Design a protein around this ligand. Structure first.
Ligand code: HEM
Ligand code: HEM
Ligand SMILES: *[C@@H]1O[C@H](CO)[C@@H](O[C@@H]2O[C@H](CO)[C@@H](O[C@H]3O[C@H](CO)[C@@H](O)[C@H](O)[C@@H]3O)[C@H](O)[C@H]2NC(C)=O)[C@H](O)[C@H]1NC(C)=O
Ligand SMILES: *[C@@H]1O[C@H](CO)[C@@H](O[C@@H]2O[C@H](CO)[C@@H](O[C@H]3O[C@H](CO)[C@@H](O)[C@H](O)[C@@H]3O)[C@H](O)[C@H]2NC(C)=O)[C@H](O)[C@H]1NC(C)=O
Ligand SMILES: *[C@@H]1O[C@H](CO)[C@@H](O[C@@H]2O[C@H](CO)[C@@H](O)[C@H](O)[C@H]2NC(C)=O)[C@H](O)[C@H]1NC(C)=O
Ligand SMILES: *[C@@H]1O[C@H](CO)[C@@H](O[C@@H]2O[C@H](CO)[C@@H](O)[C@H](O)[C@H]2NC(C)=O)[C@H](O)[C@H]1NC(C)=O
Ligand SMILES: *[C@@H]1O[C@H](CO)[C@@H](O[C@@H]2O[C@H](CO)[C@@H](O)[C@H](O)[C@H]2NC(C)=O)[C@H](O)[C@H]1NC(C)=O
Ligand SMILES: *[C@@H]1O[C@H](CO)[C@@H](O[C@@H]2O[C@H](CO)[C@@H](O)[C@H](O)[C@H]2NC(C)=O)[C@H](O)[C@H]1NC(C)=O
Ligand code: NAG
Ligand code: NAG
Ligand code: CA
Ligand code: CA
Lengths: 595, 595
């Protein structure tokens, strides 16, 4: 039967039909099922939801209940007992640029986003959670264990809310809970253009009839632009440095400002749009604005798919790609292009690759000034360090020359992320990303480590001597279940990352499986995948295989010497070459001849 | 309506059932229904709650919904246009002592306390209501009209927190909201003995046999008692004058020290008890420390009741007393003894009987001192002016010799109360009792004015020519609805207080009703009312029939000249006689004898 409980707000689009262009909402990619893969629809489930009341309450809610006959360890304890580490000494991946984790957070962002629930924009229930730590309704506090340093400093807990679900979000019911994905499952640069038409036009210079993205009129970077400042007052980017008074940037996506390096690449993508539109305009003079805006948007998306599948995914899945992402072979009209719930917890591995400091290099890539080397922690929702401090050129260099953190079984998440996190809703710099990642698993109802090791075809260990075989490490295998008590209860985020990394990759057996599949599907089920016949022509493609992130730099900044392979470890004199040694993306084929 | 309801936090006890003594909590009075009339229950309702969303948002909080098709007047605006005046001359009630005014406030405090809501305990939210004046779930501001003084001087609005409701304290749903009465509904002098098991005890000197209430050990008044100071740091009493640094008095009821005059009678009471206990002890040598309290505590309540129904009510109601309060025909157990909500707004008529200043007289009832007449406003929460500047003797001569404030359709409430009211919570001296009152009606869900004229079975005016016939004042009737636009929307408090006084009484036909009905009720449903058989003996009564407030003054102060009728006007020295001229209350009939 179909006890299809309740429905949906949803921008209802009617498709065009023959149009050679992508819709904003994400609809119509599919002819037999339109809304399949669009924004604001429940995340998909590869495996049945696992809640305490089997229907919607998270494990670790009604203390006096267990799973599989045990008490689920507090989120914050899992973090301390197993996730943290004090000494940053030589904890850096050595064949991976910082760019390697920045491009990650970007592709993640183009694929998913489960809105937190906040009804409340005047509200004090908003406060019964930050100030009293009382579980009830959407408030699901992250309690602290004994002798947790935070206790003498911030309170009894860390405010935390449940992720919105389909249908409303308020007085919730009926069938097994499924949370929403407010973005589009396609690598369609929807972080640059948006997911709701309403906002996709706000982003637009629509007074000049030459298709351009709206840009800042009050701030500059050597005659180069920054995204437009966001409207809404009580923005956090202002709070950080009350004096400076420079707000967050506004982009197709709403997380663009979390950290100064994220904002930076958001600027390159915004910038590449314009070089492309202007260019096309000059070549196809008769072309009209709307035509420019989308031929550009199309060029750009092709870009995010080629960098992502040619340069980025090989080196994550490593030797497990050929196995999961077979070589492309046409639109498989019948493949779920949607993002599964788990994916959004399996692609969080990146969290473990964020270094504890971001540095600014000066034209010869030398640490510039008295404060070129800052703490990751003083960079969340920070834009003034950009507007009022050298622009983003010195930051882009950092990304090219400095390396990312390497996932170490006994150095998982830097404290800058596990102890001093800034949440846009709050005032302190004392939240924890690891703990959040852990309850958030429970909020969404994920099944356990074993039920997932299963989904992939790997042994489901039960003996502590068994966990050791997989994790290839005793003391980790031990600390782990002195907490969970059984392999069947370990949270996927942690349980997955605990595994050693596959050959020449950056994630193990289970993560490789969950990512591999997901990615293949949004690539085989996307009607606009660039390589699929019709979306572009033989000659347009030929020109597209020559793009590179290195080239992206050369055309939108004043950097001059850059690496051929922006994603691997590169020292400054040798591994760098002046831009004229690198391919250019010939937009000639885009030329349209009249008669 | 015979149905179920929210059974929230209430001290639970077991009815002994044959104890000749009232419980402190008020519980067990009623045999068939225990709770009835108990403290911390929430207020009898005589009419439907009227709220804007039919459940809990005050009328006039959502800035666009109406009442009966019309916008509700700002709380403060009514106060400026109607309630206030600038000449305090000729405003004195020629035939009513200041004491009149004062006994009314004692009888009220014995009957009802609706706690306003929250505190927080280190809160960022008390701050969001006294700075930005932002509306929000517990904070319902009082906004300042345009062209109002307070604007230039205090700010945008003055703080106001809705009053406590019954299932919760914090935030939620389903039934018409009701406020809590934290004091026993019977006239049992519990402003003295308290309404809580735990406080009730602490308030007594258990370090002796003698069964007495504990007195202050740091300061005495000419060899006489004072109540003990209150622990509470961030005390209002000390803030007034830091140099003096004299804390608030601790009494059976919180408000005990809002003003020098109230805190005063609060001592005569306290002293009355210790006397009785002491006295009883010698006539009954073998009694118990414990038997001493409540034989006295019984003697005391009975005292309140008498003065209230016998010298006091007969002059508030006047020719409407027989109509509502017939002669006692004994305990009618089928009568709801609880205080209705409206009573708590009907009784505030006394807010308009407070004169502009408070005096201090020398033993010849001559102004005593360089600063005898003190403007009222510098007396809210004042204690040092007692303990340190004179004693209570000078004040009590004040009450007996000075006059109250006559209610006058033109001068409603003193400016010492309209503009300069002090609240314990906050710092400045610029609040408005009148505006609090009006705001407070909408908070308590008070049905409109007409909905009450009807309830008492009186003409309901619809037109302006209609409202003039009742108020017997054209101009007023006009000012009133140039603001309310319709008789239906006039806030009870004012509308009630607007009607011209009844014969030989001090309230209009409406209030006469409300107040008459309420009082009769707490008297006919109180199993312990004194005239009731069993409660006190035939002889015991015959001796209680002579208690007088003049005698109270005598036995417990060093005043020797007092009037027979302490409630009306009395000029010195013709209306004053020697304390030897007034009766004494013989306790000989309380003499128990062995076999
Ligand atoms: C600071 C934060 C980052 C940089 C130090 C960072 C980085 C990444 C990378 C590199 C990712 C994948 C390659 C990635 C995936 C996802 N993140 Fe994370 N992130 C920072 C801070 C946050 C915060 C706060 C959140 C919200 C967490 C919550 O669940 O409440 C966050 C989330 C995510 C996320 C969820 C997307 C979604 O489903 O809505 C990823 C897939 N990041 N991040
Ligand atoms: C100062 C205050 C007084 C002295 C000038 C004063 C006096 C009286 C008298 C004489 C009353 C009866 C004849 C009387 C009744 C009630 N009051 Fe009032 N009062 C002073 C100050 C206040 C403040 C502040 C309040 C709270 C107002 C609010 O609505 O928030 C107050 C209340 C009341 C009240 C309500 C009891 C209740 O239902 O909770 C009376 C019946 N007074 N007062
Ligand atoms: C708040 O944001 C301010 C930006 O508007 C920032 O002010 C600037 O920072 C420093 C003050 O210490 C000065 O800048 C110089 O600092 C180093 C030397 O330490 C130089 O190498 C740099 O080139 C740079 O010129 C600026 O004078 C100052 N500007 C202003 C207006 O103060 C503050 O640092 C921020 N304050 C906080 C607490 O975050
Ligand atoms: C703060 O409270 C003080 C009382 O605790 C009060 O001071 C009192 O008033 C004056 C001191 O200024 C003294 O009274 C008079 O004393 C002799 C008469 O005997 C006169 O010659 C003096 O000039 C003075 O007028 C009291 O002794 C003094 N009380 C105490 C305990 O010191 C202040 O007036 C109060 N301040 C405010 C702002 O209210
Ligand atoms: C660092 O990573 C690079 C990137 O993969 C490695 O070079 C690749 O090596 C594989 C075979 O192992 C080849 O398919 C490619 O020709 C190489 N790609 C690039 C971009 O160079 C390199 O071997 C790694 N460095 C070390 C020391 O292992
Ligand atoms: C929209 O596009 C127009 C066209 O370029 C922008 O106007 C130019 O702005 C630059 C720098 O701000 C000036 O040097 C030129 O003089 C302007 N050109 C013309 C023809 O007026 C405009 O700034 C853009 N606005 C937004 C919000 O992006
Ligand atoms: C002041 O008010 C009281 C009560 O209203 C008056 O009391 C009545 O006075 C008249 C004499 O004029 C008689 O009807 C009664 O004997 C009194 N009853 C009471 C309870 O006192 C009082 O007398 C008024 N002042 C004057 C001079 O009448
Ligand atoms: C509690 O009651 C006792 C019993 O009388 C009080 O004790 C006497 O207090 C007087 C007055 O200060 C002293 O002169 C006596 O010396 C005390 N006698 C005894 C046996 O203690 C006591 O002061 C009272 N305390 C309180 C706080 O009320
Ligand atoms: C797509 O589905 C078809 C239909 O069953 C099948 O030929 C094949 O498994 C899929 N093709 C690709 C390229 O994935
Ligand atoms: C007792 O109260 C009941 C209920 O209000 C009422 O019927 C009647 O007035 C009273 N009975 C007598 C005999 O007075
Ligand atoms: Ca997308
Ligand atoms: Ca009482």
């Amino acid at each position: 039967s179909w006890e299809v409980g309740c429905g949906a707000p949803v921008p209802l689009v009617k498709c065009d039909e023959n149009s050679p262009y992508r819709t904003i909402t994400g609809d119509c990619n599919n002819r037999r099922s339109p809304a399949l893969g669009a924004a604001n629809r429940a995340l998909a489930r590869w495996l049945p939801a696992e809640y305490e009341d089997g229907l919607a309450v998270p494990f670790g809610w009604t203390q006096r209940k267990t799973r599989n006959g045990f008490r689920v360890p507090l989120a914050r304890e899992v973090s301390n007992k197993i996730v943290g580490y004090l000494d940053e000494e030589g904890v850096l991946d050595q064949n991976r640029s910082l760019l390697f984790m920045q491009w990650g957070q970007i592709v993640d962002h183009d694929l998913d986003f489960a809105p937190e629930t906040e009804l409340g924009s005047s509200e004090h229930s908003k406060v019964q959670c930050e100030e009293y730590c009382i579980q009830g309704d959407n408030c699901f506090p992250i309690m602290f264990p004994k002798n947790d340093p935070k206790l003498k400093t911030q309170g009894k807990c860390m405010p935390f809310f449940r992720a919105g679900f389909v249908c409303p979000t308020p007085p919730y019911q009926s069938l097994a809970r499924d949370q929403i994905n407010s973005v589009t499952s396609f690598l369609d640069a929807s972080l640059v253009y948006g997911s709701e038409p309403s906002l996709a036009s706000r982003l637009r210079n629509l007074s000049s009839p030459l298709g351009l993205m709206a840009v800042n009129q009050e701030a500059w970077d050597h005659g180069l632009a920054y995204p437009p400042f966001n409207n809404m007052k009580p923005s956090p980017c202002e709070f950080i440095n009350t004096t400076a008074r420079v707000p967050c940037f506004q982009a197709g996506d709403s997380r663009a400002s979390e950290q100064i390096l994220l904002a930076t690449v958001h600027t390159l993508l915004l910038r590449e749009h314009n070089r492309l539109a202007r260019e096309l305009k000059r070549l196809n003079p008769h072309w009209d604005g709307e035509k420019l805006y989308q031929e550009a948007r199309k060029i750009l998306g092709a870009f995010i798919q080629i960098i992502t599948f040619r340069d980025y995914l090989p080196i994550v899945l490593g030797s497990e790609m050929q196995k999961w992402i077979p070589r492309y072979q046409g639109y498989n009209n019948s493949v779920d292009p949607r993002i599964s719930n788990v994916f959004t917890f399996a692609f969080r591995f990146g969290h473990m690759e964020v270094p504890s400091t971001v540095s600014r290099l000066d034209e010869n890539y030398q640490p510039r000034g008295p404060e070129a080397e800052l703490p990751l922690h003083t960079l969340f929702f920070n834009t003034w360090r950009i507007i009022k401090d050298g622009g983003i050129d010195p930051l882009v260099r950092g990304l090219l020359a400095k390396k990312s953190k390497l996932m170490n079984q006994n150095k998982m998440v830097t404290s800058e992320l596990r102890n001093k996190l800034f949440q846009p809703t709050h005032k302190i710099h004392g939240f924890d990303l690891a703990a959040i990642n852990l309850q958030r698993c429970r909020d969404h109802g994920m099944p356990g480590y074993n039920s997932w090791r299963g989904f992939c075809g790997l042994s489901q260990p039960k003996t502590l001597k068994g966990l050791q075989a997989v994790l290839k490490n005793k003391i980790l295998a031990k600390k782990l279940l002195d907490l969970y008590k059984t392999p069947d209860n370990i949270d996927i985020w942690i349980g997955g990352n605990a595994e050693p990394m596959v050959e020449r990759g950056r994630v193990g057996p289970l993560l490789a499986c969950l990512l591999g599949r997901q990615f293949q599907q949004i690539r085989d089920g996307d009607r606009f995948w660039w390589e699929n016949p019709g979306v572009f022509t033989e000659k347009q493609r030929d020109s597209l295989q020559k793009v590179s992130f290195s080239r992206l730099i050369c055309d939108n900044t004043h950097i001059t010497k850059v690496p051929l392979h922006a994603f691997q470890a590169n020292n400054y004199p040798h591994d760098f070459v002046d831009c004229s040694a690198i391919d250019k993306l010939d937009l000639s084929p885009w030329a349209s001849r009249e008669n």
